[PDB]
Amino acid sequence: EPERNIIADKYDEASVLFADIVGFTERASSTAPADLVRFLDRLYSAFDELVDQHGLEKIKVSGDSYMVVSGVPRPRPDHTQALADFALDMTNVAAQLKDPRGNPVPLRVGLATGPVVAGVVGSRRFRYDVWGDAVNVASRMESTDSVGQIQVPDEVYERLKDDFVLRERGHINVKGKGVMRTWYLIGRK
């Protein structure tokens, strides 16, 4: 049954992360849906542990993705930095796990900051959900990410540049809109 909206509110500013493990479908890998589910549950349980250790908020999403949010529902003035630190731990932890073949986990991570909408949605049962501008951006940062990096837009770079190390990935000129630039979040300063 499709979910429906119940209540929502706009938040001026929050930070949103998406992560996934790309190419772990039965189609792509031939691994049985049950073995996939077990290996993913391990990886996602590791991320669950990091979310709790960091005091952040996991948003139950449908689909392959893992979603984490900072400064929504409850604001914190370091929301971007806190999600960056969590993102770094998430990719550094995943880098110590391997698939069953002993190959690196093909993790993608995108991270964005900006307005969002949050509230309650549900079908039979309900859950807290977050969507809108920064979620859209985070989603695109994750789905065009190079595997093993953390991709972020300019807005995140402006907010983090003094305290983390970032390297520019590239830019594209879109006439007549403007320039689209993204960065890799590499580490802490």
Author numbering: 237 to 425
Authors' description from the paper:
Rv1625c is one of 16 adenylyl cyclases encoded in the genome of Mycobacterium tuberculosis. Adenylyl cyclases convert ATP to cyclic AMP, and these enzymes are classified into six types based on their sequence similarity. In solution Rv1625c exists predominantly as a monomer, with a small amount of dimer. It has been shown previously that the monomer is active and the dimeric fraction is inactive.
To further elucidate the role of this residue in dimer stabilization, a single mutant F363R of Rv1625c (Rv1625c-F363R) was generated. The single mutant eluted predominantly as a dimer in gel filtration which showed much lower activity (63 ± 13 pmol cAMP min−1 mg−1) compared with the wild-type enzyme (199 ± 30 nmol cAMP min−1 mg−1). The structure solved by MR has one monomer in the asymmetric unit. It cannot form crystallographic dimers as the protein crystallized in space group P212121, thus indicating that the protein crystallized as a monomer in spite of being a dimer in solution. Clear electron density was observed for the region Glu237–Lys425, with 42 and 18 residues missing at the N- and C-termini, respectively. The overall fold of the monomer is similar to other reported class III ACs with the conserved β1–α1–α2–β2–β3–α3–β4 core. Because of this salt-bridge interaction between the N-terminal Glu239 and the mutated Arg363 residue, the N-terminal segment is pulled towards the dimer-interface region. When the monomers of Rv1625c-F363R are individually superposed on different subunits of dimeric ACs or GCs, the extended N-terminal segment of one monomer was found to make steric clashes with the residues of helix α2 and strand β2 of the other subunit. Thus, the extended region of the N-terminus of this structure, stabilized by the mutated residue, hinders dimer formation. Similar to the triple mutant, the residues present in the β2–β3 loop of Rv1625c-F363R also make steric clashes with the subunit when superposed on the dimeric AC structure in addition to the severe steric clashes made by the extended N-terminal loop.
